[model samples]
Target: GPLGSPSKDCGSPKYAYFNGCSSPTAPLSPMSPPGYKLVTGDRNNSSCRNYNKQASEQNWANYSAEQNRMGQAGSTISNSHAQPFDFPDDNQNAKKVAAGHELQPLAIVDQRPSSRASSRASSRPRPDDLEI
Candidate 1:
């Protein structure tokens, strides 16, 4: 290999992309979090994943915009108003917050480790019982 190959051409700092050189930048934009889907529509037809995505993204948009405008230091913007993802039920729960009643029903069962057998395990007769 030649020791004097042209050095990497770092892109301009102004625009996001430049000629064959692209500059890497912070990924602060809103996006669907890991293991979540984005389904948009009315609550009844909407999904919890989408709701969460919207809320998080909205908060990020506001914080990032404000931070940019005010020129704040550090990553305080994200910490200003962090949000947690929740199910559609959360929308109803928020209304009850004023009454000091908040519950996360969805949080109760988002994960299941056990693997259940087929439905026929209970209703159907076992083949071993009829073999003899």
Candidate 2:
């Protein structure tokens, strides 16, 4: 038998503990269960969305706390899956340099002085010099 969408249950209060829907400057207490794994609603209803959002917030809070202990102050959780920490310099630039990409000077040298004679235009042609 096919199991339809499950009931709309927003799991535990610990999930929504990250937010202060019912608190004003009150510190948050641990909402996670001692021996229970976190779960999300299977249904995609409005109620389920709220449940998912709560879980996401809880996860973000946990991750941010972990990062702060490592001296990454003012840090927040990244929405995407990426490296745990950032590189000192952009790895993209480093890879390009390693792949033979050279950094040149911003100003290009004018080669016209060396390409042709410098004495020809030292002075303008005199009226007598023009015999054409």
Candidate 3:
């Protein structure tokens, strides 16, 4: 039998605990049960479908709690690092060096005098030129 299905009988002590409506009559908790074993049938059975629905509903509450806890923990960590940590000045210098090496050939080509025959012969821009 499934948890919430009216037609399905919640078998014995363990299964009865999961029956939502049985709480008032039985007064036994599933977590505290000694020899109780909860059972759900295979997919083909009606009990399985009912069990899935019950499990899904229960999981929604559990998932919400878990996510809320995680969010709070994450916000605490994030707030701690909100202010300026380390300056990225070293990264900026490294970027400039990389850019200079990449653009050297293009800079030389651009600086060539217009009177030079090679300069006039080549109209296309050099590959190392960066637009941005």
- Whole-model Cα lDDT per candidate? 0.43, 0.45, 0.48
- The regions of model 1 sitting more than 4 angstroms off are 1-42, 49-56, 59-65, 68-70, 75-132
State which candidate, 1 or 2, has the greater lDDT.
2
Q: Per-residue lDDT of 1-132 in model 2, one digit per residue for the tens?
A: 557645425565345556546656464664443744344643334444444334444421232344444343224433233465556434643453343334432234434365466655656566766875
Residue 37 lDDT (model 2)? 32
In candidate 2, position 32 carries an lDDT of: 42
Ranking by lDDT: 3, 2, 1
TM-score of 1: 0.14
**Model 2 residue-pair collision total:** 1
lDDT tens digits, residue span 1-77, model 1: 76653644455456645465454644667643583443444455444453453344442123234345345423333
Each prediction's RMSD to truth: 23.0, 22.2, 21.7
Q: Residue 32 deviation, candidate 2, in Å?
A: 27
**Which candidate comes out best when scored by TM-score?**
2
Residue 19's lDDT within candidate 3 is 43
Clashing pairs in 3: none
User: Following a full C-alpha superposition, what root-mean-square deviation does model 3 have from the true structure?
Assistant: 21.7
Winner on lDDT between 1 and 3 is 3
Please provide, for model 3 over 30-126, each residue's C-alpha lDDT reduced to its tens digit, 9 standing for 90 to 100. 4445734444443343443443334444421232344665565565553344358534333533453454456352454554575676746765566
